[PDB]
């Protein structure tokens, strides 16, 4: 309810301006933020081609 | 009373004095009616027996430090940099705490058909009316009031127990939760269950009922409000707790 | 000399009349001034304005309402007894 | 030295002790009341339990093991039901009227005549104290009326008597050095130095039933700012029991109506299996 | 006290005079016993050796051959310091300042450690007198002995690489909770090497002839493992004792020398002394008169003599 | 330090009445300068 | 979501509670669609949301069929259904009309 | 090691280029990412069946 | 200046405290301004007479 | 403030946490209090006295005799807005002493006696110097 | 000095009063140094640390932790003790009660556990309020360091069985360590946890060093100087132990701190540091059992 | 009606329970308040992350 006896609508076609902007794939700093303090080896069966 | 220390002299002054009741009957009752807030947030914390170490472990090592770190791995009560021979368990203090002090939840196995009508009621954990008040003044009575399960339960009068896996001697609360055996109790965490399952402390405990209720504005608690997760009481800093249970 | 309003009373003999500061310049502060300079007229003070004390209320024990329930009485050497304790009939 | 500065900083040690001596001599009179709050509460039983305790003794007496049981089985009900009554029923009235009047005389008069009585400005002797906190005394007075408030009499008997307390004003100074000649004489000129540059005492005397009490609250006066927990607050520790993961007995497996707690039509209705979850 | 003074030598930055006021109860390492001394040998520029600054193991070796001193009273002319090594004869219990993240205990021995913490650098800077000041961090001594073993072994990993880069950091500490991370920036070799050798050479002498009979009972240790609580908790998971399990060697000459009793002597001679030969000697003990059981971070605790 | 501290030496020269009393340290993040009474100070003499 | 906006703040409650009276809103009422705050000087808003790091749920529901039951309080509102779910208000605004 | 709806984060090999070899030369552990292709790639603790 | 209350036993003994805090003037300066139009000054001067 | 003042009495991490959860629910409850259950005549009255009694009285000043109405002094201010004070007048507190006030006129201090000399020669200029300066020559003989 | 008072609790009997008359001059341990103390800080029941009775390890943790106090004059309603640990060095002469060895004119005597001697000797119990005062034994520094390493060596032969360690002459006397009839069976269960501590710190380190030093010197001033002072000592111990025993760096250096952490525990546990000195005046220089001795404050 | 609000969206998992809502909470799912800390100099951001 808005500023009245109004009722509004927030149906999930609302999400088109938020996520569909091409920054969703932009994860370069995240791998750049995690790759220091390096991990131990984690028996890579399915990580290796 | 003087004492010379670093800096300068330091005078200490004390005046010895005493009191008396000076009333043949009861005087000065004290009611209790308003509450500010709970001190604890009323619960949801596992109990960790790996805090204690009195129990003899598994003999196969492949099961020993597999099942040990399977539980301890991330518990809010989980011993990291583990148990020194001399030292403390080092409970993990987290960075921020919101709702207050934490309560501790402990567990006793029960059969599934120990009917719920025994609950919804002020009923007792160990399935038996266990207090030293209830007996019939025989002075060998309260081991039989707590264990003689050829007799009945004074709490639930048509039967002997409510839980055979709680009530009797060596009935597995008797091994885990009795401080005379103390597989636990090397832990700084206050067990909530030590008030029950203790035949030694309820070994007649006091029985003159008239003196008994004035000690219920007394009897310094098992708990201390000074820690993040509640601990068993350090011998300093008494608290004059009410504690009817 | 540094505080100029202090030198409005000279209280002593300006007496040598020799070429100042062409000597040893041993002075901790000295100013070779022409006819005028603006710093001569500056007036400044950092002032003290307030100090307050609270009353420390010496409250006797025979004032409050809880004096009624007690009958306090003088007895020295109560440290010397192991028992001075009271016995009563009914 | 002959400098007045030597005398002037000699002043500022005297005006250091002259505030400190009153601080420790004050601390006993402050400490005198704090003992009384311990020694009353040490002998105070909780009054949700003594209102049946007297009416157990309102008989001949019984130890025949039957009355001992029926004492306990009523005693646990009075505590399980009416313990926190004010606040449990604060919406009501004319029960809090009845709640105090038994609390006014649940105890019994001691073996005591004082010989020095606290008056009521007419003639009336006072027979109770009723120490309460500051927070409770506020909402109690304005809704549960109310009296003439002046204590005509409170005598300075042999109870505190600071004439015996004047020794450590001089002897502690005598224990060190020649400060003994000073520390008693300085207290004479300290009366205007530190302060500024059988009698009546105000109190509150509510009369209930046919009785009279000095209803007075502390901690706004004589416990504040001293880092002391106010002794009329405390802890009730109650252990709780929750059965977890048990199972419905053979009789109570009904629904109380046909259509209720029904899932969407392609769903198992998970309420039909033994529960392991618990909610509180 | 056997009073020792350090004067304010030359000039004052006017807020930095107040910076010397809030250092009351700290520790100055002055490498002497003087009735008066300049402030030049006080600061960390004197701790810096020829050309190079010590590491946090070298500062242990730098705090070896100097003398700690307690700030007693702060004048604008001098600073009176009491010589800890001699003048600890204080029934007045001359007071110290706890500058440490750990709330201690009552009754702890207290030894001094260089600032190695991630957030308690204790760096105060003087620019009129160009000096840098690192105050030591007073800590409880088992927690102090838990630190020095880490930092040398971290420098033991400075000799050999071999392993993959994911090493156990030796940089998470445990006191009842309280995850602590310290600084790992530089490891000078000679401070590691001389500390490593005394760890080697003392562990040489701590083995004797009758010591060898004890080595037979290594499979006897795991027999207690699956049948009690105390032993199984005593036996560490990250131990070689669980790894080495997967005999008199007679040579018996005379047999009246008490060979088993003589084993525990010389083992205690050198392996019994491993905390104090690597680190500084504890001489400070927690002793509060008011019955306070702990001492807050930033407080002024009363200090008594050698433990 | 002392240009706040002289005010406590000026508070040693008192005229100013403080009306209501609560704990000072709860308002530690309010004042410009705080001093603490601990029974004595070797500086104030 | 700026930890620096947490990191820059202190914690002593002697000083904290008075900025809850007068703090700076990031929003300004002086534009048609609300904006990031210009250097148009200050606001002196109340704003408890920063000091508590909180937010409030309002009366909302997945369907109007729950929202009709949401009227006249939380006495008898259908909190959930088959997959449909309601959130009753919890706010300083509870009890009020608008 | 789970950060984003459209990607994955898993402790893989250090340097090895993917279309090659039989066994990876297990040295140091360097973590890397990959693209989640579909909506079904999200884990089933974050979606009931 | 704070009082104290003498307890006993396991709680530690107390000793009187003193406070001595110092506070600083802040200086505000508030402003008013007004105008005289050009026609009025020579009228007030006595010029345009 | 009203819970916050209660913890400033009696003198601590558990006391810190038990404050804040209690505080944020009390904020969600006891705010916008006049519009919420303003029908309760009783609720506003005790809410007014906590407005009246929560703050700390500072050191009283003897000079400004701001008392009015035949001799009872004035100890509060309570500046509100327009419609609230009318509504507070109309039903809740129709409680009027008078409408009559006896304020005072200004006070002052001008650098006259020695304050001049302590400012243009010395730096420190004591407010009400001469009453202090005499008494600094009075205390040492007591 | 700074004499501290310990409060006598309520109603005790005359033998409980006479039990307080057989202890004038003993040694008492206390947690804090409050000028008025109670008896609840004193008793052996105040030594509970994990919910059970402490062992000789659990005492020697506290015996190195809390503070010694020596009762000069016994009192009704009070206990006066001028404590040792306060005061400047070699001042405040105090008086002790000897136990069976001498306590010569010097020696710097050390407080230590009761069950290294007769266990229910000096475990003086109050009968009325039902508490137990287990007074420590003041032994001088050579023999105190001697007997502590013998019973734990005797605990080894009592651990896993198949000379006799218990004779141990003094300068003149023959000191019977064995109080056979009921004590020694209680000895090996009251030093029970302690023997495991002397063992596990040896089995860990020796089996750590023999995979440390072969992993060192090739992974150079410490290299050649490793066996320089250890020529035919460590390599001979490498010849003797590594043959008749068994033979990993990232758990190894993790075990390096942990053993040496346990090592720093034991040095505070063991070795029984001197706390008070006998250096009297005008005595016979030799103290006997049951006789007083002027004892001065600091080592 | 007046000035507009601005709705922003944050990717959340579908099986994050409604019981976390109908309650005053962070939008991030974890408490982050610096007032929740206890002055340890690390109970900043390591509370949040």
XYZ file of N, CA, C and O in Angstrom, chain B residues 3-6 53-61 64-65 80-81 83 85 88-93, chain E residues 91-94 150 172-178 224-230 232-234 237 242 289:
200
model
N 49.206 0.591 55.260
C 50.075 -0.255 54.454
C 50.806 0.636 53.474
O 50.177 1.365 52.703
N 52.123 0.557 53.495
C 52.948 1.408 52.663
C 53.310 0.690 51.378
O 53.864 -0.410 51.397
N 52.968 1.315 50.256
C 53.190 0.756 48.931
C 53.993 1.753 48.107
O 54.524 2.739 48.627
N 54.083 1.473 46.809
C 54.673 2.434 45.894
C 53.828 3.692 45.813
O 52.615 3.669 46.039
N 36.862 -34.060 28.447
C 37.787 -35.060 27.935
C 37.869 -36.298 28.815
O 38.760 -37.128 28.619
N 36.962 -36.444 29.775
C 37.079 -37.543 30.718
C 36.724 -38.888 30.111
O 37.117 -39.935 30.629
N 35.984 -38.877 29.006
C 35.522 -40.116 28.408
C 36.666 -40.843 27.703
O 37.490 -40.222 27.029
N 36.752 -42.155 27.873
C 37.714 -42.940 27.114
C 37.325 -42.985 25.649
O 36.192 -43.348 25.309
N 38.236 -42.628 24.754
C 37.861 -42.455 23.346
C 37.735 -43.763 22.592
O 37.817 -44.847 23.179
N 37.520 -43.659 21.284
C 37.551 -44.819 20.408
C 38.953 -45.403 20.355
O 39.944 -44.711 20.579
N 39.033 -46.699 20.066
C 40.341 -47.336 20.018
C 40.941 -47.261 18.621
O 42.153 -47.074 18.466
N 40.113 -47.395 17.592
C 40.597 -47.191 16.232
C 40.846 -45.706 15.994
O 39.960 -44.877 16.223
N 42.055 -45.366 15.546
C 42.387 -43.957 15.367
C 41.667 -43.374 14.163
O 41.332 -42.184 14.147
N 38.790 -42.177 15.442
C 38.986 -41.286 16.580
C 39.002 -39.829 16.155
O 38.158 -39.040 16.591
N 39.952 -39.449 15.304
C 39.999 -38.069 14.838
C 39.237 -37.869 13.544
O 39.463 -36.871 12.853
N 38.743 -24.834 19.400
C 39.852 -24.650 18.477
C 41.129 -24.514 19.289
O 41.057 -24.208 20.486
N 42.297 -24.726 18.624
C 43.656 -24.868 19.165
C 43.587 -25.753 20.408
O 43.621 -25.264 21.545
N 42.446 -28.981 23.185
C 42.460 -29.067 24.647
C 43.844 -29.286 25.225
O 44.402 -30.381 25.077
N 46.683 -29.985 28.134
C 46.692 -30.822 29.324
C 46.588 -29.895 30.523
O 45.816 -30.146 31.455
N 42.938 -24.059 29.483
C 41.494 -23.972 29.323
C 41.103 -24.365 27.904
O 41.937 -24.426 27.000
N 39.807 -24.628 27.719
C 39.313 -25.108 26.436
C 39.300 -24.025 25.367
O 39.259 -24.366 24.179
N 39.333 -22.746 25.764
C 39.365 -21.580 24.871
C 38.158 -21.568 23.924
O 38.264 -21.845 22.728
N 37.001 -21.329 24.533
C 35.726 -21.129 23.834
C 35.877 -20.026 22.792
O 36.455 -18.966 23.099
N 35.424 -20.223 21.553
C 35.617 -19.190 20.530
C 34.700 -18.011 20.778
O 33.490 -18.091 20.551
N 35.268 -16.907 21.238
C 34.474 -15.697 21.338
C 34.315 -15.113 19.943
O 35.293 -14.940 19.212
N 57.895 -2.575 47.778
C 56.679 -2.949 48.487
C 55.536 -2.018 48.110
O 54.365 -2.326 48.356
N 55.861 -0.877 47.504
C 54.870 -0.002 46.919
C 54.386 -0.506 45.577
O 53.389 0.008 45.057
N 55.074 -1.522 45.028
C 54.738 -2.228 43.788
C 54.557 -1.267 42.621
O 53.416 -1.002 42.222
N 55.673 -0.673 42.176
C 55.690 0.345 41.129
C 54.942 -0.134 39.885
O 55.024 -1.300 39.485
N 56.341 -19.970 17.358
C 55.777 -19.750 16.031
C 56.742 -18.992 15.138
O 56.956 -19.364 13.980
N 47.542 -17.771 13.393
C 46.256 -17.777 14.080
C 46.489 -18.271 15.502
O 46.915 -19.412 15.710
N 46.210 -17.419 16.479
C 46.451 -17.736 17.880
C 45.127 -17.907 18.615
O 44.087 -17.404 18.187
N 45.192 -18.588 19.762
C 44.021 -19.041 20.501
C 44.196 -18.773 21.989
O 45.039 -19.402 22.633
N 43.401 -17.850 22.531
C 43.235 -17.691 23.975
C 41.746 -17.616 24.280
O 41.151 -16.534 24.199
N 41.131 -18.788 24.523
C 39.750 -18.974 25.013
C 38.762 -18.601 23.908
O 37.543 -18.707 24.135
N 39.211 -18.186 22.731
C 38.424 -17.588 21.679
C 39.454 -16.801 20.904
O 40.527 -17.342 20.614
N 39.142 -15.541 20.578
C 40.124 -14.482 20.339
C 41.146 -14.779 19.247
O 42.340 -14.908 19.538
N 46.906 -46.765 25.867
C 46.025 -45.954 26.690
C 45.094 -45.074 25.873
O 44.243 -44.392 26.454
N 45.228 -45.070 24.545
C 44.521 -44.092 23.726
C 43.045 -44.435 23.583
O 42.181 -43.556 23.662
N 42.735 -45.703 23.365
C 41.357 -46.095 23.119
C 40.646 -46.585 24.368
O 39.646 -47.297 24.248
N 41.125 -46.226 25.556
C 40.535 -46.739 26.784
C 40.394 -45.697 27.885
O 40.114 -46.066 29.030
N 40.573 -44.413 27.582
C 40.405 -43.357 28.570
C 40.100 -42.046 27.864
O 39.995 -41.990 26.637
N 39.936 -40.995 28.653
C 39.752 -39.685 28.076
C 41.011 -38.844 28.082
O 41.296 -38.140 27.109
N 41.773 -38.931 29.171
C 42.843 -37.989 29.458
C 44.002 -38.153 28.479
O 44.595 -37.181 28.005
N 43.955 -39.743 25.416
C 43.491 -39.457 24.067
C 43.414 -37.967 23.784
O 43.691 -37.535 22.664
N 43.093 -37.169 24.801
C 43.166 -35.724 24.655
C 44.606 -35.231 24.747
O 44.966 -34.234 24.113
N 45.440 -35.915 25.535
C 46.853 -35.552 25.620
C 47.570 -35.841 24.307
O 48.422 -35.062 23.864
N 46.561 -34.758 17.598
C 46.340 -35.284 16.258
C 47.471 -34.880 15.329
O 47.971 -35.701 14.553
N 51.595 -40.156 16.895
C 50.654 -41.018 16.182
C 51.214 -41.455 14.834
O 50.691 -42.382 14.205
N 45.743 -5.470 44.518
C 45.443 -5.507 45.943
C 43.942 -5.547 46.198
O 43.493 -6.092 47.212
